[PDB]
Amino acid sequence: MKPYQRQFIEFALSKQVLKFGEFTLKSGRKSPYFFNAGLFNTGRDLALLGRFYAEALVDSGIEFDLLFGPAYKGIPIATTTAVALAEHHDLDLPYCFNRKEAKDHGEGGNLVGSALQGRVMLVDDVITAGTAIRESMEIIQANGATLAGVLISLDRQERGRGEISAIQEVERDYNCKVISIITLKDLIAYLEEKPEMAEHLAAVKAYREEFGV
Amino acid sequence: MKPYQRQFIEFALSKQVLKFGEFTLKSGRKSPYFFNAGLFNTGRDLALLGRFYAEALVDSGIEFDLLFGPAYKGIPIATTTAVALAEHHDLDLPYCFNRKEAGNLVGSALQGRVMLVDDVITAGTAIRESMEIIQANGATLAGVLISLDRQERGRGEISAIQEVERDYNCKVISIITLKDLIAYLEEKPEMAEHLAAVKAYREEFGV
Numbered sequence: 302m303k304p305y306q307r308q309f310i311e312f313a314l315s316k317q318v319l320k321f322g323e324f325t326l327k328s329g330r331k332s333p334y335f336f337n338a339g340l341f342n343t344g345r346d347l348a349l350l351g352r353f354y355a356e357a358l359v360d361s362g363i364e365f366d367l368l369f370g371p372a373y374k375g376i377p378i379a380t381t382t383a384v385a386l387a388e389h390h391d392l393d394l395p396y397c398f399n400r401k402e403a404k405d406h407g408e409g410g411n412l413v414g415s416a417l418q419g420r421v422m423l424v425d426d427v428i429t430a431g432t433a434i435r436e437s438m439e440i441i442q443a444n445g446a447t448l449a450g451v452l453i454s455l456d457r458q459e460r461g462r463g464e465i466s467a468i469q470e471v472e473r474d475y476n477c478k479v480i481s482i483i484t485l486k487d488l489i490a491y492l493e494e495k496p497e498m499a500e501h502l503a504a505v506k507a508y509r510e511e512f513g514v
Numbered sequence: 515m516k517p518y519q520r521q522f523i524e525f526a527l528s529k530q531v532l533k534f535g536e537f538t539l540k541s542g543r544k545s546p547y548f549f550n551a552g553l554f555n556t557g558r559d560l561a562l563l564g565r566f567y568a569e570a571l572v573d574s575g576i577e578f579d580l581l582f583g584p585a586y587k588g589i590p591i592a593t594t595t596a597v598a599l600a601e602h603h604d605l606d607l608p609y610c611f612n613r614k615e616a617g618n619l620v621g622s623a624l625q626g627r628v629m630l631v632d633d634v635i636t637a638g639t640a641i642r643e644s645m646e647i648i649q650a651n652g653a654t655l656a657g658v659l660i661s662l663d664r665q666e667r668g669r670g671e672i673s674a675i676q677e678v679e680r681d682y683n684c685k686v687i688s689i690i691t692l693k694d695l696i697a698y699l700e701e702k703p704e705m706a707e708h709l710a711a712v713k714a715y716r717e718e719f720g721v
């Protein structure tokens with residue numbers, strides 16, 4: 302993996318976003334690890350998070366005109382990623398996010414920020430079943446914009462309800478590329494680096510054997 | 515004024531956040547100027563916005579444990595302010611925001627002395643609702659920080675900021691005030707007509 306990807310795993314572990322134990326996922330599966338991006342819940346965590354998103358985005362080489370974050374979890378992510386693109390990559394990008402219902406006052410509709418136009422980069426944390434993307438895609442399409450990509454923190458690389466993963470479902474359903482800062486493959490690689498992580502390594506590898514794509 | 519205040523006025527003008535013309539405010543008053551923080555809508559705008567909020571916060575000296583932004587406008591403001599505190603002031607603050615439709619909170623636990631951040635205060639509705647939430651969690655209100663204090667009357671004798679300050683015994687601070695805007699416009703010969711209109715508005719509605 303690239304250095305920033307190893308650093309991102311180290312960051313997620315340090316802020317207790319990446320945890321090990323016995324978790325029940327939205328699907329009902331029992332997983333030995335869980336990535337709870339909601340625990341990036343301080344200003345330093347947000348600052349670094351945006352920097353890691355921005356690095357992954359620039360690394361991908363995908364061209365885009367605007368960053369969109371879905372209400373609610375996407376709003377801080379899009380904000381900090383936009384800041385980091387300006388502060389650390391000499392890129393001053395429009396951002397946008399939605400409100401779940403229109404205000405009484407004014408004609409802003411359901412959008413906040415810049416006009417929703419051009420090639421949109423959608424930011425998200427972890428795709429489980431694609432619902433936040435679906436709501437977002439309906440908004441992107443209704444505004445005449447296109448989806449340049451979806452940028453997420455972690456691709457768990459595991460089956461959805463059927464044969465393909467949730468990320469592969471989004472890629473097919475919305476005909477797009479999903480960019481991830483890290484994957485399950487990267488997590489497994491990181492866990493090979495120190496003997497203290499060997500129990501977690503075995504558990505995560507067993508999970509991949511059962512559910513990985 | 516302080517350098518960050520002059521720079522914030524210049525920046526707001528350059529991004530059309532501060533604009534002149536004829537606007538109808540939430541109060542129905544016809545104002546010759548309007549401050550729309552929602553037009554700080556690019557990454558550079560957001561980066562600098564948070565710096566300006568962070569500078570006003572540290573300048574105030576108010577002690578606080580957590581930054582809260584009311585949904586929706588306060589969410590990006592609190593986010594970028596928290597980023598700038600960490601990146602430019604070596605201060606790593608918990609942040610929080612609510613879901614407007616109303617569990618109802620995102621971010622760090624709502625505890626301790628909370629600094630609210632908002633764009634403007636018109637009637638005090640976002641603060642009233644946010645204060646309900648903050649006090650219901652046992653937290654206290656360290657302050658409210660806004661971009662611009664328009665220094666105008668509310669429905670009665672006092673301003674909406676003064677209502678907030680008294681109703682909640684809390685401190686409201688602002689990056690800039692109308693008095694700062696007037697001081698700046700007095701320096702710019704090309705803004706003389708705008709200045710006159712703003713001064714006439716202040717004569718009618720100023721507190």
Ligand SMILES: O=C(O)c1cc(=O)[nH]c(=O)[nH]1
Nearest residue numbers: 326327335336337427429
């Ligand atoms: O429910 C899941 O599958 C899930 C959600 C989430 O936020 N993080 C994770 O690692 N899995």
Ligand SMILES: O=C(O)c1cc(=O)[nH]c(=O)[nH]1
Nearest residue numbers: 539540548549550634636
């Ligand atoms: O009074 C208002 O409605 C108001 C004034 C202003 O300058 N900005 C804003 O957002 N609202």
